[PDB]
Design a protein around this ligand. Structure first.
Ligand SMILES: N[C@@H](CSOO)C(=O)O
Ligand SMILES: [Fe+2]
Length: 187
């Protein structure tokens, strides 16, 4: 505070560095500033590198170690596993298109079908928030005709998580990778 409207992606990044200067996170403030940034495709084209077969993760800023800010690019029909967020805050702001978010409870030790809690459609410029205390989720671009682009902020940064088998609740550890960093493809 004061929380001012980010004028550009670069301005948003500057404001985020201020909000993450300390050791804690004001979730509502971070969400509000992410929401207030009006997506401008020209500002993030550099990062919007798609793959034909699955969604991509494109690192934008390393947050001076406090957070990772990245752009995810979802082709038509591309989605995630049901997954957690490794004891981190996770903000998801739509830059282009729409994504379906399905929420799930943490499974019990007992093998069982994971039934959805709820679902919603996240629309252009909206910012959602998740953490492990809230639950697990799947995120999907269910469109047949429109790619989706989202802006994700994780604090602290993390590069592993778990994917959950919808049929059993069984989890496995996954290492996350980056498709690009700072606009540069990182095979
Ligand atoms: N957590 C997923 C995206 S859905 O997360 O908000 C990822 O970073 O790949
Ligand atoms: Fe997620």
């Amino acid at each position: 505070t004061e929380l001012l409207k980010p004028r550009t992606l670069a301005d948003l990044i500057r404001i985020l560095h201020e909000l993450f200067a300390g050791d804690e996170v004001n979730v509502e403030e971070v969400q509000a500033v992410l929401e207030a940034y009006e997506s401008n495709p020209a500002e993030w084209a550099l990062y919007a590198k798609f793959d034909q077969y699955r969604y991509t993760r494109n690192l934008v800023d390393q947050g001076n170690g406090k957070f990772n800010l990245m752009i995810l690019c979802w082709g038509e029909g591309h989605g995630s596993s049901i997954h957690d967020h490794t004891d981190s805050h996770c903000f998801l702001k739509l830059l282009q298109g729409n994504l379906k978010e399905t929420l799930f409870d943490w499974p019990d030790k007992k093998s069982n079908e994971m039934i959805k809690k709820s679902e919603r459609t996240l629309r252009e410029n909206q910012c959602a928030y998740i953490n492990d205390s809230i639950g697990l989720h799947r995120v999907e671009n269910v469109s047949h005709t429109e790619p989706a682009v989202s802006l994700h902020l994780y604090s602290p940064p993390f590069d592993t998580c778990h994917a959950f088998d919808q049929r059993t609740g069984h989890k496995n550890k996954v290492t996350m990778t980056f498709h690009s960093k700072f606009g540069i493809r990182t095979p």
